[model samples]
Target: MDKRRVVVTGIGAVTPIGNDAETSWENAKKGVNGVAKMTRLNPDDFPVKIAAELKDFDVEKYLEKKEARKMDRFTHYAIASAEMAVQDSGLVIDDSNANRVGVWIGSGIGGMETFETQYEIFLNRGHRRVSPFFVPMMIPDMGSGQVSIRFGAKGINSTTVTACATATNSIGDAFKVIERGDADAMITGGAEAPITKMSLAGFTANKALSLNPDPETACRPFDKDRDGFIIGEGAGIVILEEYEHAKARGAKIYAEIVGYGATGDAYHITAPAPNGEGAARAMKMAIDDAGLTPDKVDYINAHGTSTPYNDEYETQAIKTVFGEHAKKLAISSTKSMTGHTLGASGGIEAIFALLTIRDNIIAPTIHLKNQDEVCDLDYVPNEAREANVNVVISNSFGFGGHNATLVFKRIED
Candidate 1:
């Protein structure tokens, strides 16, 4: 049987850089830095004192005050973005077709703040002091659950938690569901709110966060002076619809998702495999799945986490998959500006790729002053560039050795 085609009809984002997708894209194109002095936690407590935190987020704008209070910040981000996406798509989820729509949102660390707060309450005032909504608010899958409940989507409600790869994997899985005729339309992406005290303390202890106090230069990808990823909190949600369905409704199509590849390192828990063999396989698998040659891929949204191991290994992975074409590819890491959103990184980066294909502009990887020896890619350093981008690939890798690649193509009517 011929596989059904899927296309992105809408995109939404609530990032440190912007509150909505259009605003986020505009700021990203301008190469704006979103990281700032950490305000979610007391700076005196943790070595890492910077983060890409959402500014002026009002949950009351999206949900009722009581309802919003019951959910965690992560779910708030998810519902806000998902609602925006549904509105953008102009796809109505009425009772007639509500069962045909689905929601699949991913989160790396669900509600660390809620967990830590409730745990303290439990210790101090006993279990009876904890709120009845504590368990529902703390689970990673609650993002998906709350979104489905809010939107009345009843089909294939689920969430994927593959650490940093959660968003990419969730999107990929949703794409397959639509491709295989499981759902007509799907709400899929990633959301994360992990800048709590415990999260900051843990990452600082593990040495996974950047200690740089300056927000402007903290999360510099591919730069020689890069240290580690800057923790970020946000959500990015996209609306995916079957191609024919989108066409029938005259839905504005952003781009067609043509290929998805997922693999595991089977090598390490926190560290990537030597020379990025697993990531290389994931890229190749995506290319092959798209039935396109490496040379045909015009741009790559790299998993450039800015850490010592990730940037170098991801660079090696690109070279392995693209060969000489890798040198010519216009690759960039938006994380330099938005900081790493962990699970939400893939969803936001995928939107960036779609925008790049739609507008023919590549966002830059800022703060890349002195390039590292092993990490010498175009990187579109520090400024956006104009180009005729056709096929774009976005990559995401997680701590549990999960590697995910999503390929998007410009729609040619």
Candidate 2:
């Protein structure tokens, strides 16, 4: 059977940089730093004293008080972004179409706050005191479940859990579902809320977080003195619809998702494979899946986590895959400004790729002062640049050796 085409009809996001997708993209282009001294948790107790936190997010804006109370913060963000995306798409889900729509939102550390709170209650007040809604709100798949329920979507309700690569893998799988004629539309992306005390403690113990006290300069991807990623929380949702289905409804097309590639390092639990061997394969596969050569890729939204190894290795991966073109490719890490939102980074970066195609501009990697010699590439540092952005790729590498890359391009006439 001939494969069907998939196009992104709508996009939504809630990030440390902005509460909405438009604002986030704008802030990203402006190179605004979202990381600040940790306020979600007590900074005095942890060595990692900074995070990219959501500010003034009112759940009641999108959900009811009772409904919002039963769910966790991660679910709140997923629902908020999903609702916005569906509304933006103008795809009404009635009985005729309900069964053809799906939801596949992924979360890395789902409802950590709920787990921690309920565990504390279990320790002090016993299991009988635990809330009945604890289990439903604590699972990683609840984001997709709640979204499907909210929209009355009865098809392919699931999520992926590949740590930081969760969102990208979920989206790629959703795209294939549409391409294979299994679904007409999918609400897919990622959501994350990992700012709780226990989550912070765990990341700190593993030494995965930066100890930089200055939030503005802490997340300096590709910088010479970079330490590690600054933890963040957010959600990004996109409406992927079959091309014919979307064009029939005169829906707005953000971009076309043409390719997906995934791989695993299978080397270490936390560290990437030497020289980004797995990452290079993932990029090469993605470009090949698109039926295009590496030279056609205009920009890459890199998974530059501001870590010492990640920046250096991702550079080597690009060099291995693109060769001399590596120096010409416009690459930037939005995480330099938004911080690393873990699972949500993929979805958020995907949206940025689409926007880059729409606006013909490349987002900046802020705080990139004293660039690392090992990471010698065009990082588009400190300032946004207007360019002919046609083919864009977003890369997401997870903790457990998972690597996912998605290819987005300007909609074909």
Candidate 3:
């Protein structure tokens, strides 16, 4: 059967850098560092002190007082971002055709705050004092569930979980569903609210959180002195529709989703495959899926998590996939500025890729003062650049060896 085409009509984000899509993209282009000393926790009390936190978020703007109180912060973030995306798409999901629309959001860890709070309550008060909504609030699937219920989308409702690659997997899987004629439209992406005390302690114990005190220079993606990732909390959502459906509805198209590739290293649970062989395969598959060659690809938004292994392995993977043309492709890690949004990173970066194509500009990978020996690509460096980005590839590599790549093309006649 011939595959159907899919296009991104709208994008939204509640990110550390900015609360909305336009502001986030602008801050990214300026290479603004969202990483700051953690205000959510008392650094004097915790070992890790830095995070990419959403500085100012007002839930009341999107949800009512009664509705917002019952939901966890992560769900609130997801619903708020979804509202922004729906508004951006200009699609009113009233009684008509609501069944054809669907929600597919992902989260690596869901509602850690709820879990921590309930556990604390159980310890302090009693077992019977636990809230009835605790289970639904803490489940990883609740992000999608809440979004579907809020928007009245009755089609396919599901969630994808692949650690940090959750959002990319969700978006890619949603695209496949629409391409296979399963749904006309999908409200897809990912959210993360894992910056709680337990999360901080767990990551710190694993030695995954960077000890760098300076927020501006903490997340140096390809820098030689980089130690680890800075934990970030945010949500990103995109509205995707079948090409004909979007066109028929007169929806504003941002870009076309042409290719998706998902693979697993099967090599390790925490570490990526040596030299990113699995990651390379995923990128190669995406290029092939797009009906194009490596040379035709103009830009790559790398899953450059600023960790030692990921930077080296991802650089090797790019070289393996692009061969001699690797040097010509414009590559950048927006994580340098946005920090690693974990589950939300893929969707947020995907939005940046679309904006890059729409705006004819490439954002920078800040703090590349001393490049790592293994990473020697044209990373767009610490400044934005102008380029005709016609075809773009966005990569997301997750723990447990999950690797996903998505390809987007500028809409053309």
TM-score of each: 0.99, 0.99, 0.98
Q: Judging by TM-score, tell me the better candidate of 2 and 3.
A: 2
Instruction: Give per-residue lDDT, candidate 3, residue 333.
Output: 94
| Candidate 3 lDDT over residue span 95-202, tens digit each | 778888999999998889999999999999999999988899999889899999988999899999998899999999999999999888999999999889998888
Q: Rank the candidates by lDDT, best first.
A: 2, 1, 3
Question: lDDT by residue for model 1 over 1-413, one digit each (tens)?
Answer: 57999999999989998999888889989999999988888888778878999988888889898898898999999999998999999999999988889998999999988999899999999989899999999999999999998889999999999989999999999999999999999999999999998888788888888888998888899999999999898999999999999999999999999999999999988888889899999999998988999999999998889999999999999999889898998899999988989999999889989999988999999999896887888999999999999999999977889999999999876
| After superposition, candidate 2 runs with Cα above 4 Å error | none
In candidate 1, list every pair of residues with a backbone clash: none
Predicted structure 1: lDDT: 0.92
Cα RMSD, each candidate: 0.9, 0.7, 0.9
Candidate 1 is scored at a TM of: 0.99
Clash pairs, candidate 3, are none
Model 3 has a clash total of 0
